Amino acid sequence: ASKRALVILAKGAEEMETVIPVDVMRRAGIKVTVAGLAGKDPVQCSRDVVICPDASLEDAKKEGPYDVVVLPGGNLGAQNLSESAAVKEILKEQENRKGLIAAICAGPTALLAHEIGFGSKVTTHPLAKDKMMNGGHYTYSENRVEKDGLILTSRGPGTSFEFALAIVEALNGKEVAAQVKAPLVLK
Amino acid sequence: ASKRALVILAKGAEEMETVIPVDVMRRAGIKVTVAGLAGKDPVQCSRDVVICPDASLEDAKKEGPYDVVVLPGGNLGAQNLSESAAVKEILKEQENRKGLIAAICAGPTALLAHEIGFGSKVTTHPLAKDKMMNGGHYTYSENRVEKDGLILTSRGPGTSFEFALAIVEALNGKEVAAQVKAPLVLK
Ligand SMILES: *[C@@]1(=O)C(=O)N([C])C2=[C][C]=[C][C]=C21
Numbered sequence: 425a426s427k428r429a430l431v432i433l434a435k436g437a438e439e440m441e442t443v444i445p446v447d448v449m450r451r452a453g454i455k456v457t458v459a460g461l462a463g464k465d466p467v468q469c470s471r472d473v474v475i476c477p478d479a480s481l482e483d484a485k486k487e488g489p490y491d492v493v494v495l496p497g498g499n500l501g502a503q504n505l506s507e508s509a510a511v512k513e514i515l516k517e518q519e520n521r522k523g524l525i526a527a528i529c530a531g532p533t534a535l536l537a538h539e540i541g542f543g544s545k546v547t548t549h550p551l552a553k554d555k556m557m558n559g560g561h562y563t564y565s566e567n568r569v570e571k572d573g574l575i576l577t578s579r580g581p582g583t584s585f586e587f588a589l590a591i592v593e594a595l596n597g598k599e600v601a602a603q604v605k606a607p608l609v610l611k
Numbered sequence: 612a613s614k615r616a617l618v619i620l621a622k623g624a625e626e627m628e629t630v631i632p633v634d635v636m637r638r639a640g641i642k643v644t645v646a647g648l649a650g651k652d653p654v655q656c657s658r659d660v661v662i663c664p665d666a667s668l669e670d671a672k673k674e675g676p677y678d679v680v681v682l683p684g685g686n687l688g689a690q691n692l693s694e695s696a697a698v699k700e701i702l703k704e705q706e707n708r709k710g711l712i713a714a715i716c717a718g719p720t721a722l723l724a725h726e727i728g729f730g731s732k733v734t735t736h737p738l739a740k741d742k743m744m745n746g747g748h749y750t751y752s753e754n755r756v757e758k759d760g761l762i763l764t765s766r767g768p769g770t771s772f773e774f775a776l777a778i779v780e781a782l783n784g785k786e787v788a789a790q791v792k793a794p795l796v797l798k
């Protein structure tokens with residue numbers, strides 16, 4: 425059975441951090457649902473790229489659970505994710521079932537907001553470190569991609585391929601990740 | 612005056628190769644128009660990400676000329692660009708005025724289709740080399756980003772940041788490109 429990914433798309437999400445994981449995961453044969461936080465309508469990302477979600481989050485939640493829940497970054501995107509009771513419920517459910525949770529850039533700050541994965545080693549964008557570390561509930565890492573417990577984190581647009589390929593490896597194995605990687609012309 | 616970029620978005624475009632340059636160029640303060648080849652409606656990219664263009668190509672052409680015309684890749688996207696008389700006209704005009712033309716992955720094959728920049732050194736995705744080189748009208752390069760005459764080319768999703776930053780450097784200078792690069796957390 426194909427693995428399934430939920431990518432939660434809020435206004436102000438970093439569009440590179442949204443599209444790179446969606447694309448790379450689809451290349452791996454993962455069934456990806458791009459779910460609009462606010463509903464079914466198109467989402468204005470941080471740099472004004474407008475993306476049409478596959479579904480509302482409300483509708484996508486009904487089709488859960490998912491093998492991974494992915495939280496893109498962007499400060500304002502992450503803030504919207506952090507303020508959402510629906511996001512809280514999804515992440516709590518995912519944590520309770522020991523499923524993978526993946527977040528990049530400022531995205532991991534939504535884990536703090538929703539009290540998810542406390543005690544884990546995490547990374548973030550450098551500019552989001554202080555927010556993430558308020559209260560010392562996580563252990564900070566400068567690795568480009570970090571994985572600890574349920575929790576897979578990464579730093580920025582320039583770590584998005586690595587982040588996406590780490591998701592692929594977690595879900596579909598190292599050989600699939602390598603096969604998906606080769607045609608991308610990565611460094 | 613801000614520099615201006617036209618990014619031509621066709622069905623089957625590689626969404627990473629579309630979004631990374633749009634985003635990075637906007638970070639550099641370039642005014643970017645994402646122009647829909649087919650009209651104003653949303654565009655289904657190669658991996659099913661749906662992007663809403665800023666304008667139709669028909670409308671964006673009226674607001675030309677641009678400091679750069681950017682052609683994303685994706686085989687079917689590039690084919691659509693190659694078949695378009697509107698694209699032909701835009702690229703011919705840009706070449707005639709000695710403006711920058713930038714293409715990635717299979718995107719450079721549209722330059723061949725429209726007889727643009729013959730004699731230039733170019734790169735492409737490895738799988739698009741034979742198509743690009745039919746007739747020996749260009750000189751092939753394996754560099755991740757290649758620039759020769761008017762013509763800036765690059766290889767794939769994994770060279771998209773380098774490609775975008777090379778555009779930024781060409782338009783806004785090396786220091787702006789460096790400033791935009793640093794917060795991205797690139798390797
Ligand atoms: C991330 O996308 C993000 O969330 N943050 C705070 C950031 C800063 C600079 C560049 C990228 C990003």
Ligand SMILES: *[C@@]1(=O)C(=O)N([C])C2=[C][C]=[C][C]=C21
Nearest residue numbers: 607625684685686716717736
């Ligand atoms: C490019 O986006 C493209 O145009 N081509 C042919 C390709 C092949 C593999 C991976 C990326 C790409």
